[PDB]
């Protein structure tokens, strides 16, 4: 497997960091197998196909809400069945109310889980919207989720192989021109 040269990684200033514009902490995280790096994204294809993905996610959310209301109706039916089963029973309030409290807590945690999963679906959607090259990505589970959902339209990697792939397809002239323009126009610590 490819490996990096310690001289051009560690020595201050981090030459790889300066060339690729990566903070040394991010670079150390990437090369030593602690976070992914996106090395390729198809911007035009995703922009063109955005309506289909939007339709898919809207359909998924609508189905989620349908399942939510179905669960609510099922819970209501179960509560009515419990009430009918224990209506004529004469006992203390807590004895007959423990099961109802348990059912209410079950419904509360069910809707909490539904809220959490729709929120995480929105999180994945937002993460996919603003994905760009050289974007570090920890939280392995999130990466696997995003890969299985939309594995096409991009590529990611780990270790020195990702840095090799980036260095291979790197346009020095364009970045140099951008830096020169910023130096001519910009001022402040950005210029330095």
């Amino acid at each position: 497997a490819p490996v990096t040269h310690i001289w051009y990684f560690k020595g201050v200033p981090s030459r790889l960091g300066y060339l690729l514009d990566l903070a040394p902490k991010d670079l150390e995280k990437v090369i030593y197998f602690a976070a992914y790096m996106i090395t390729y994204v198809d911007d035009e294809r995703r922009t063109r196909d955005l309506p289909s993905l939007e339709a898919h996610v809207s359909v998924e959310r609508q189905q989620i809400e349908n399942r939510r209301d179905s669960d609510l109706e099922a819970r209501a039916k179960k509560l009515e069945n419990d009430l009918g089963e224990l209506e004529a029973e004469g006992a203390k309030a807590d004895v007959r109310r423990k099961v109802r409290e348990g059912a209410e807590r079950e419904m509360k945690q069910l809707r909490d889980r539904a809220q959490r999963e729709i929120d995480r679906l929105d999180e994945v959607w937002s993460r996919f919207k603003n994905l760009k090259v050289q974007d570090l990505e920890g939280d392995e589970l999130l990466y696997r989720e995003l890969r299985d959902r939309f594995g096409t339209y991009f590529d990611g990697s780990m270790g020195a192989a990702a840095l090799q792939k980036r260095l291979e397809s790197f346009d020095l002239e364009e970045e140099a021109e951008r830096l020169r323009e910023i130096i001519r126009t910009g001022k402040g610590q950005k210029k330095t």
């Binding site: 150390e28 995280k29 090369i31 030593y32 197998f33 602690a34």
Partner: protein, 301 residues
Amino acid sequence: ATADPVKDYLKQIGKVPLLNAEQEVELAKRIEAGLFAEDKLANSDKLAPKLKRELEIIAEDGRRAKNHLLEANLRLVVSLAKRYTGRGMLFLDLIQEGNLGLIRAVEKFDYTKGYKFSTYATWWIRQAITRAMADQARTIRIPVHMVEVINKLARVQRQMLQDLGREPTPEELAKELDMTPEKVIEVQKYGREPISLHTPLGEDGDSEFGDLIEDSEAVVPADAVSFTLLQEQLHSVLDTLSEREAGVVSMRFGLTDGQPKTLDEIGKVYGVTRERIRQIESKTMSKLRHPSRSQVLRDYL
């Protein structure tokens, strides 16, 4: 990314929880069925697309089961490998060798024996770890059997020293180990660890152990000049001899070319017989081995 990788690996392996016996049996059954489906796919029967899809799905499920078993059991390898720490190999190398052993064990496990999976895995893990430590622990490698003999001798010596209260003599170990004392000393000698050339011996911290080792096989100019003078002086002594004598001596000993030719080769040039070459050489040796020309050459010997 942290300065310590052992902690990172340890905290990473613990995310996957453990497994129970029924889960292990079910995973093994999944692996078996998936592989048999893979073989059936390897067979060239068309069957139906839906059946092919189902067979592929169960094969993937079996692969997932094998993986899951491996992640679940990595903790056993980590636990086993920690008591072999030291002795050259580092901790993570031992862990990885144990992981290879565990993979080998998982490749060859069965549930019909009704034993918990930990036993077979433990045997194979220990076997792999000890073999690896036998093969990757010394700069000058030693075969497995010799390492075993060294370990046995060291253990016996330690036990004898502890129980008896004195250092055992070579004869005591020889009679205890059932081998000759020469073998005992040879086994003791084979096991030593090479010193390092960079160990500092200067109190101020400037010198090293390797700066005082003489290059024994170094061309000494005095010896080279002496040999050159010998080579130049040898030819002159042959010069005073007759033409044929010097020629045959040079060809026989290959002074001019370095290839000692046979008697027939020498006689071919002059056309004399083999026996003649035999005699002519002898007279030259008698002449040189005389108290009349030896003095010029006595010193160089």
